[PDB]
Design a protein around this nucleic acid. Sequence first.
DNA 1: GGGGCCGGAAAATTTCTACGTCTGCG
DNA 2: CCGCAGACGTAGAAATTTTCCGGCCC
Length: 293
Amino acid sequence: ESINPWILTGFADAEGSFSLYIRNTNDRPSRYETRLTFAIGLHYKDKSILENIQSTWKVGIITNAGNNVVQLRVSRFEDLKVIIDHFEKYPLITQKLGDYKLFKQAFSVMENKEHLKENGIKELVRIKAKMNWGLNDELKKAFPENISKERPLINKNIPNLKWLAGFTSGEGYFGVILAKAATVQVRLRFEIGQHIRDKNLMNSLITYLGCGHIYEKNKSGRSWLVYTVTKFSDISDKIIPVFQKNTLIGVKLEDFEDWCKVAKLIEEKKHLTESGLDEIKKIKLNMNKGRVF
DNA sequence: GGGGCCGGAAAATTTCTACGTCTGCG
DNA sequence: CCGCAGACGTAGAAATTTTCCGGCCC
Ligand SMILES: [Ca+2]
Ligand SMILES: [Ca+2]
């Protein structure tokens, strides 16, 4: 099977990373190891997606990262052209685009075979210093002048609903909340978490989907925004119809279907009856984390 | 030949997904 | 009072990254 190119980009914004590995490998003459890698790590539950991504790009190796996680890795340099080609037509809009643009700069250095010289390594370590989590402590002390490269910031809009379909397939959550004598209410909930570095992008969802709210949640010293929709009228009229015209991917798609089954049962006002609550309870206990198959 | 390149597993780190609740409201 | 839902919590694991041996192969 295959995946829509914008959906894949939306999924690449959610999951997947751009890696640059640098390592000292010799010293009699000083040499360094350099490798680029794009990798999407998923649960083996969604191994089908990686195979589908592998079916569209026709490159990359699926590895088993252990701990219930399979991973699609692409590292072959000639096969990297395929990925670059794709993301020029269907670009990322999150802050991962910055990690992507720096990833391309590393590709340019390795392509001109400059990474085999002292000038290329010194340039590459500056690129890595602004990518993801930056340089390791070894390279920080080996190359002290490593804060020269500019981290390209990103302020982009949502390209279309096709991108949103892929972004929801990764970060989305369709939950049937059974809120609990004054405690037995049924609630449908659709929320999306994201790092606060993409606050502008997250807030665009409210104006783009014409509904929803955003709440910041803190764990220890970390922070992430959560775009949330709870109003049922906004769900049945604005949230559900969107993901129907633009189909999701993975097992999250069937989670969406069961999420719709409850919605149709709620609009029919069967969620306030004894009978209609039974099939809802059966649905909620067999979806998301409630299912293992 | 030999050294950069690459299949492949896996540790490091955290940003997610999942799922409640308290509370005011009409 | 019942039902809706805004605002706001925590668990913990599916994720985001980084790691590098062995050994093809240009
Ligand atoms: Ca993400
Ligand atoms: Ca996901």
